[PDB]
Amino acid sequence: NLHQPLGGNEMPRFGGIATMMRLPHVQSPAELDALDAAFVGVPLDIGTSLRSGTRFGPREIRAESVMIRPYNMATGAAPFDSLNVADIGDVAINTFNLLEAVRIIEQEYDRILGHGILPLTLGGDHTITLPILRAIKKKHGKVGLVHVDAHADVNDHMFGEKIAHGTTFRRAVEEDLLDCDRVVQIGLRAQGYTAEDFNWSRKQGFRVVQAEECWHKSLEPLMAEVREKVGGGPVYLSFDIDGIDPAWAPGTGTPEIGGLTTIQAMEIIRGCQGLDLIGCDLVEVSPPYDTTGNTSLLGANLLYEMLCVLPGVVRR
Amino acid sequence: NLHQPLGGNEMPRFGGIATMMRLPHVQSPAELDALDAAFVGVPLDIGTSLRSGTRFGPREIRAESVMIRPYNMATGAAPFDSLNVADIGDVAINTFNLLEAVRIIEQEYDRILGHGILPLTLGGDHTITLPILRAIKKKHGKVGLVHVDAHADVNDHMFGEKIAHGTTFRRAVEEDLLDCDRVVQIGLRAQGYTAEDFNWSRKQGFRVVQAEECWHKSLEPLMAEVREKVGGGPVYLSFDIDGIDPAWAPGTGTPEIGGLTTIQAMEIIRGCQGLDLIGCDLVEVSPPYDTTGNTSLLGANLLYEMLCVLPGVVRR
Amino acid sequence: NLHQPLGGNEMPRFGGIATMMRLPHVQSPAELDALDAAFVGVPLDIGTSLRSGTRFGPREIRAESVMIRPYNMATGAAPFDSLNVADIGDVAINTFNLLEAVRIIEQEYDRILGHGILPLTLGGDHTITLPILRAIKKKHGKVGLVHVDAHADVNDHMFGEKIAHGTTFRRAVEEDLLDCDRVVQIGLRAQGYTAEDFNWSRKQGFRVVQAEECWHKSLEPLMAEVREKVGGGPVYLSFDIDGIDPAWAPGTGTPEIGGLTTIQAMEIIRGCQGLDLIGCDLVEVSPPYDTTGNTSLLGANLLYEMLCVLPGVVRR
Amino acid sequence: NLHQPLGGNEMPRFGGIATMMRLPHVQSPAELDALDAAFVGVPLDIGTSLRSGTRFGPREIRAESVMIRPYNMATGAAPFDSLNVADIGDVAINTFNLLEAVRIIEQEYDRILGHGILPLTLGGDHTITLPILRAIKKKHGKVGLVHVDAHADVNDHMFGEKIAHGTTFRRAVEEDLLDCDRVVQIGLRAQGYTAEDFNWSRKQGFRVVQAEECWHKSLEPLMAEVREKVGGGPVYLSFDIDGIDPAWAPGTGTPEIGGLTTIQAMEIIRGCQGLDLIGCDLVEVSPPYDTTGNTSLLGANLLYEMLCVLPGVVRR
Amino acid sequence: NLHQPLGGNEMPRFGGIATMMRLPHVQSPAELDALDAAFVGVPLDIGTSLRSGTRFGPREIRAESVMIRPYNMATGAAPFDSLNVADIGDVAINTFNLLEAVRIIEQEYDRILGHGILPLTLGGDHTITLPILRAIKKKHGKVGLVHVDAHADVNDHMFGEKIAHGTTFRRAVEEDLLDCDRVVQIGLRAQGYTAEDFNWSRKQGFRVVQAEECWHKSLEPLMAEVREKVGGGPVYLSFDIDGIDPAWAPGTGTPEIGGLTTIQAMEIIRGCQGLDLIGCDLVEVSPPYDTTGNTSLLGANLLYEMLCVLPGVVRR
Amino acid sequence: NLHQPLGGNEMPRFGGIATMMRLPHVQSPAELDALDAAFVGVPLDIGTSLRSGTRFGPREIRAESVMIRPYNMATGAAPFDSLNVADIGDVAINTFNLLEAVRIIEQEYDRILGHGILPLTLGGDHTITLPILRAIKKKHGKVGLVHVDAHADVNDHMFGEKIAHGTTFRRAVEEDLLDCDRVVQIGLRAQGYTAEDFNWSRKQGFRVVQAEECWHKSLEPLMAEVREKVGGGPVYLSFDIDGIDPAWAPGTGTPEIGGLTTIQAMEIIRGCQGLDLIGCDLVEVSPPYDTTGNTSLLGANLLYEMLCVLPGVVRR
Ligand SMILES: [Mn+2]
Ligand SMILES: [Mn+2]
Ligand SMILES: [Mn+2]
Ligand SMILES: [Mn+2]
Ligand SMILES: [Mn+2]
Ligand SMILES: [Mn+2]
Ligand SMILES: [Mn+2]
Ligand SMILES: [Mn+2]
Ligand SMILES: [Mn+2]
Ligand SMILES: [Mn+2]
Ligand SMILES: [Mn+2]
Ligand SMILES: [Mn+2]
């Protein structure tokens, strides 16, 4: 017995209660022990430097997800034949105190990994990834990283404060959470202050791929290099939506011109097949800055492709 | 131990799964036997004559309802300390055949009344009220009526067809479902073909109140006349959203200028206190014609006022 | 046989070619000689001082008019049983030269009045009313006036130029076109420079009714006073849409807070019954500043009430 | 005599009555006999499975078409010098009964072909193509097909019903309307249930081209293979708007990510030159789900390119 | 010499740098000494319980203000002939730490009062009023209060925290900042938990005026009673925009149905003439939840009426 | 010391007065003589032939520009370490008379060049470029030109008038302002009347590059040929926003399908390095036809790339 999404011949897709992919809602400790993987949300926006609004991200992603079917026509992957999956709700953060919210997040992820669940996370601003990595290292050790973004996110401070959505990866290196020689950053562009704005990462041991190197091309051959750099151990995956061009994704906090296409984004995720993935996330979707709901529709479709490449999924 | 809505100190209101008023989702036969009343939806729009879109009605009303609290500051009513209430989901209609859909509605409402539950319905176009009244009459006998609308809805045909959203109450009289001496219609205005468009109702025994009789006035004295006319037995309440002026409710299928205010709408519902109510509905909300979400927020608040005046509710 | 609008049982109201009220389109010399009244448009916006866009006015009004039925339930008026009416198209203005556009307008209205037709005009900014009144005097002589607006429109100049949308009624007085002892202005409010901004009109002989005199009241008693002041000869009616409060009409060039309601606007037009009317207009609707289409819908419904009160209409 | 679109020096393009490309409206029997080709509309949406609204499709396409000029700069084609063309209105469907509407469509297309006119159709959902093909076969016999879509549309049933917008081309094979060896389908993608969802078509004799085969490329060499396959007889062209990526076409019923560009769409239509075309259509545009009008403007421009490639048109 | 706003005959109102009412921007110490009053902004939103976005409040209010003229036609007030006024910019808050932001606000207002300036403040959420009152008391002593809102704002905690946007006036009583016998609250409505939610304020010494007491009437007689209650010393004025009905002001954080009109709001402010006012504010405007820009336009016009009633203004 | 833009550690980017890139505002004769270059605006829209609204162009471009940082990561350019730059305001045009507005433009640009300043212009419709070139020729002599557009703009007349937004470059040839052997036009497409619509330019000595020559290609090799053709003397750059595909830039007056990408636009500007540029402009942005603000954000970012390639700028 494995859980399945609701079909159109059972109930029309414009109706029914709106969970992720119309799946069952599980809460008890006894039933949590029987799951292989699960969807979960974290509604925080008090770490933003420009536009707010990403507190409503998890709700709109769930609402648009009612269109998706179970079997992948292009690759042949069928995850609902192999694994047991469900929707487990949201985390209750403190919206009036930032450092108190960070404490709560680490505590709840300690409980999830205790039951043996691999998480797929709906955000939320980029500050959330720091306390998540604190719990991951306690279970697995030092990890590798594949990071998609329009910004490097390695600032020393923001308005004199140490913890914010632009300092996440500077803190991770200082706390000894990563294996520095197994890291790649893809999509960096736009303006800065000095040449050291990209050169600091290269000196630590990272490989940096700017958007100019991606223009006019397919990224199928590039991912062979990426597998060579990060492989030979456990790996985490983190995706910022502002990496994609605003023609496809207008609903976000800090947009930048001339970026990646949606075809190119599909080539990256499908090319992760063969790695030892231990967790994934999708961040920075902001509903009040897109009227059509198209940005949220894109996020749900990319989360489906992530499930398809987890270890143990059969092809038919 | 009665059901209660989720509080803001447990989980912030922009988070959590979106059921009506964030209540439990009841599905088992044993749990259905223990309920006094419940919210339920019917997503149909294939009976409309102008704009479509009311199939998404029940989904948006649930989403905006997250801000309602349980105690009435003005009247003192407290329904959740008196009755056992929950959310029971949607009815699975056939969107490709209109006559088959009408059959499905009567069948499912026969089962709901079998468990001993009083229904509060979310629509959906005005064709739904006909098969609902068929099930009511079998249980209680002939009933009275309070009807709020900008139109009469008593046409003999529409493009040659007998069953449509503008013929509902003509069919109800021919089938012997109503007590003709206990009926009132409130809000009628705009254009027609001849004088018989309003005079047909008066001939059958109904009392008609045109919008011109409502301008510049408080409606507390009017509702005293209403209670004297329709009292002495059981009664049903049916509310079309297009009775209210488009300045307050722009998202609907057939709008008409110069109508009732939201202050006057509150005076109507609160004035039903004392009657033997056996069921209620709220129809014709259409999401894609109002981008702010304000029309759906209005609908959720009015449904709460309806719950406060049911028989058996205590005051503190 | 007289012309009739297209009915619903002939073709559904969402289809068909989009003329005003779905009426015939008339062009020949013989067919023009046989009409008692007609609808006509003038698409000009090069005389505006803040927001532009009223050039699209005539097109959106026609599109929202498809809802209107032919008989008046409240008053009993039936215009299509007594008069011969149709749609005669638009005037071909020069959008690159303002003074040349003014010359074209006077010439074409000389032709319309030569056929014996009474015009009902769709605008367009308020500059159009000057060359229209020039043609009216040639046929009828000096006339009285009923004027609804939030502004006085009696400036001596605008950026040094003599002809603009805020100088219209200053020029009409200087050119000896009006009977000064038969004029009323209704709805003026907001800010100015000195007390003479409203007092100049009073010195000429006009009556001025400020918005403060209208607050909280029905306007039926006021219109009894108005009829005795302006009666005894021919009269023209001119309606600027910014007279109505922005809660009902946001799509306009220069809006002002705290104005008249739609109920009050209906009381003004219905109270003109009994006067010798020779022409009417409805100006300043701007489509790109209202996304719902509600401002254009209000405009079409008010023009129908204007048709109902013309001399020669039968009651049934 | 030859019909021509209205020029800018006669009347500014934001003015005048809104027919397709501002052409004459033809209604009499004598004038219908003299036409070589014509534009016509069918406003139906009661066969949709997700979002509704394509009933307003034909009205918005006409309104945005006021921009187009007669001469093709790239190809040298000039259709208005070789053929006599006009706008003939809409078909009067029954919006309360699906099977009754299907009967009406076949009967009215029998009359159109009786005058000897070649049709270019504005939709409307994809159910309309079935009864159109029933009428075409009676005049020409069995035909070949070029089909552009994101979906296969070969279902056996939908919620138990045989006639719906996803069963169209399954019914055509069973009724013997096509030559199975002269058919191509271009653009299919996304999720399904089993591998047989694409392989059923291949077993019948069709060639299938998935979106992955199209990425990063020019489509000029592909269309040379297409002309060889379907040539040697009469052929029909059918275009579903959801074949194009949502970055360009957000206003539609069932969107899917990562599709074709507008450059690739022009390469397909221009590549049909030399074939014996007998009819064309453009379906599934839904106005209430796009807030700019950009989806309707694209539809109007693609229909102009279809006109340029008909037999009889000369190059200069 | 006194500062004046820019006129239309110098530069058209759609052009020029967008300061408040197009006034000079003052920065130097010597020029600050010579001002009688000034406009100033505080862009904070990290204290909100539901919707965020009021950080952009000050920017949109400035842009919509380019319409206002200097002389009051109804009251005859002329503030620019009596006082010296300008725009002085924004306060630089810390958006990553809430308690540090409160410290910064108190320090800067100590400086503004040191130059001898009376402040008119643009917000910003309701947490800002607490540090402002801490600075007022040092100069003047304890003060009276006129407060317009749909909520009481007297909570002890929010999610366990003492300082938030719903606890403002509870902290003010504890710290001895007010004279409890000279306070009035106007406009409270909707749902709660117990009767004590409104009863606490009555026992302290306040007068409470619910929305039900205001329905259907003019507020001229009420304001005469208010002047008697709060007169005798210095007084502050605080205006929450959610006190007005959502038909006029949809762009706000926590909306509630059935409220005050804009006519009633005008009667309140104009009725303050004669009191010893020492400061004013206008809070909670949120731009991303109102696309038209009408909520911001309302806020700018209400601020002008506040300037007219300050002590020392002449009438002509 | 040279002028610098404001940083985030001084004041958060959602606050502060909105000048271009948050730079100082310069007005005095003494401070003007000290500037090497400056930003300046011209708000005209009375010469358009379809949609109006580009009068608000300069205001929205300023508001979105608050995001830009000073150092170019890709090229290494640093303009703020080399040149002295500021914001100098708008030109006061006559919105009621087109010919008088043209006289005003030429006069003010004579004064700007008299101070020795190189201009970077914000528009405004394409009529403004004619009077600008009249003042340029008086100072420098005959000049070369790089022109980006979807249209040729070489009409002899519009509606009988010789000065309009589509005749600009025809007038420039007749008045002897250009070196005809040093001109290139890039991006022309869509429909016309005859083959001479593009062939007139070829006969004068121009090179024409149509859109079909740009499809599927990088534009680096093209710009090497362009530099050879126009070099060896002073040169002007003019950029019409409708040259880019409507997927990226929907807010414009006359849009055409299937154009250039934003990647291709970046390759054009960066490829101008090495030329003797004397002035630049960016025209035809219309805010009310794009609600997201994305069209204005694109315009601001392109103007920064123009500043980076001026003679005298150093690389690091
Ligand atoms: Mn980023
Ligand atoms: Mn990031
Ligand atoms: Mn109705
Ligand atoms: Mn109804
Ligand atoms: Mn006005
Ligand atoms: Mn006016
Ligand atoms: Mn499809
Ligand atoms: Mn299809
Ligand atoms: Mn409040
Ligand atoms: Mn408050
Ligand atoms: Mn152009
Ligand atoms: Mn141009």
Side-chain angles (χ1 to χ4, degrees), chain A residues 126 147 149 151 153 165 240 242 284:
Chain A
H126 225 148
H147 177 219
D149 209 310
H151 315 96
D153 294 357
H165 79 141
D240 185 353
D242 68 36
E284 299 272 9

Side-chain angles (χ1 to χ4, degrees), chain C residues 56 59, chain D residues 13 18-20 58-67:
Chain C
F56 279 98
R59 189 163 283 170
Chain D
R13 292 179 183 269
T19 51
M20 186 72 184
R59 189 165 272 166
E60 199 178 56
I61 294 167
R62 284 176 165 105
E64 296 281 342
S65 70
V66 293
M67 59 137 292

Side-chain angles (χ1 to χ4, degrees), chain C residues 151-164:
Chain C
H151 312 92
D153 294 355
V154 289
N155 287 5
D156 199 21
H157 73 98
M158 274 179 161
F159 214 84
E161 307 289 309
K162 307 268 145 134
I163 309 298

Side-chain angles (χ1 to χ4, degrees), chain B residues 45 47 50 52 55 94 96, chain D residues 45 47-48 50 52 55 96 161:
Chain B
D45 75 358
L50 189 63
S52 62
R55 62 175 74 182
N94 186 336
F96 308 103
Chain D
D45 73 3
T48 54
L50 191 60
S52 69
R55 62 176 70 182
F96 304 101
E161 301 289 327

